[PDB]
Symmetry: C2
Subunit: 69 residues, 2 copies
């Protein structure tokens, strides 16, 4: 639902940014990025779990409209 | 003269120690070790240069005792 998409993208760019710091020996910034990534993943798990939890709230059923299409 | 040896040994263990921090994502310790390694190499260059500076001061001569041995 257009939420875990962008959140996952931020995790990707953060990981690349940390890799650049590691190869450049900029460990001062790398330490901050490591904690930031953990923050992103922590909220990522909660956001995904609540989404699938709400998915079970409603049941997807077919209808003659779908077959008509 | 037991000077470049001891400095090189400390540089060697520091280099391995930094790798331990990097693989363990201990970036805070990595920065501290990185500065220490640079400081040691600074002393290594000075000690190595001044060692051969003293060596060039005198010239080794072949005494007849060396031939006798």
């Amino acid at each position: 639902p257009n939420n875990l998409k962008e959140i996952e993208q931020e995790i990707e760019k953060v990981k690349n940014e940390k890799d650049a710091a590691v190869h450049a020996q900029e460990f001062e910034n790398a330490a901050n990025l490591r904690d930031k990534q953990t923050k992103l993943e922590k909220q990522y798990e909660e956001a995904k779990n609540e989404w699938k939890n709400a998915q079970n709230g409603m049941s997807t059923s077919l209808s003659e409209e779908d077959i008509a299409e």
